[PDB]
UniProtKB/Swiss-Prot annotation:
It comes from Homo sapiens (Human). Induction: Following heat shock stress. Residues 26-160 form the YTH domain. (Microbial infection) Proteolytically cleaved by HIV-1 protease when incorporated into HIV-1 particles in a nucleocapsid-dependent-manner. Cleavage by HIV-1 protease probably ensures optimal infectivity of the mature virion. Interacts with CNOT1; promoting recruitment of the CCR4-NOT complex. Interacts with YTHDF1. Interacts with YTHDF2. Interacts with PAN3. The record marks V148, P149, Q180, E181 as: (Microbial infection) Cleavage. Keywords: Acetylation, Cytoplasm, Host-virus interaction, Phosphoprotein, RNA-binding. Its main location: cytoplasm. One of its GO terms (cellular component) is P-body. This is YTH domain-containing family protein 3. The disordered regions have the ability to interact with each other and to 'phase separate' into liquid droplets within the cytosol following binding to mRNAs containing multiple m6A-modified residues. This leads to the partition of m6A-containing mRNAs into membraneless compartments, where mRNAs may be stored, degraded or used to transport mRNAs to dendritic arbors in neurons.
Length: 191
């Protein structure tokens, strides 16, 4: 286990056993990430960034929720065929600061997150749940920042929370540490 990840696991409480999936209120959105690298950076730095369109949608929902319930984010890397975890949105969107940690280097802005679940859940465990707000297409064919209606979100979160996973993005944390070192070395060589 890479020492950087060991410390993150020590300071956090990933994959809790008492998560309340029977949401009484709050709101739930799908996050469709470009790349595994972004998940690694988000876990390390507890920030996320979507496109300009996606950031505005998440900011508006977080602000309208007014702290009365949680806003959860269900993450899936594009092309992967699975979800890779769940985080809670923990701040308003900052539209002006570049985070400098995404595969899409051009993205401006960020918001704070708290990672709760970090676990791979195959799409075949969720594809039967359809979203009445996306003309009843499966939740697994959603685009980035698609909202999951509350009752469907309870079903999805129950499956994610209880799934006996075998793999997660933590498995090759060492690879992404090395990629970050190289990404940073490349920027230093430019300067």
């Amino acid at each position: 286990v890479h020492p950087v990840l060991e410390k993150l696991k020590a300071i956090n409480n990933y994959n809790p056993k008492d998560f309340d999936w029977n949401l009484k209120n709050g709101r739930v959105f799908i996050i469709k990430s470009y790349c595994e690298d972004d998940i690694h950076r988000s876990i390390k730095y507890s920030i996320w960034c979507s496109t300009e369109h996606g950031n505005k949608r998440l900011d508006a929902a977080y602000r309208s929720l007014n702290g009365k319930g949680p806003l959860y984010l269900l993450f899936s890397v594009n092309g992967s065929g699975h979800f890779c975890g769940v985080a809670e949105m923990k701040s308003v969107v900052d539209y002006n600061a570049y985070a400098g940690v995404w595969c899409q280097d051009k993205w401006k802005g960020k918001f704070e997150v708290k990672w709760i679940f970090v676990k791979d859940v195959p799409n075949n465990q969720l594809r039967h749940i359809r979203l009445e707000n996306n003309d009843n297409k499966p939740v697994t064919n959603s685009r980035d920042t698609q909202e999951v209606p509350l009752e469907k979100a309870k079903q999805v979160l129950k499956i994610i929370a209880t799934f006996k996973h075998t793999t997660s993005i933590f498995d090759d944390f060492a690879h992404y540490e090395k990629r970050q070192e190289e990404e940073e070395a490349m920027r230093r060589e430019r300067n």
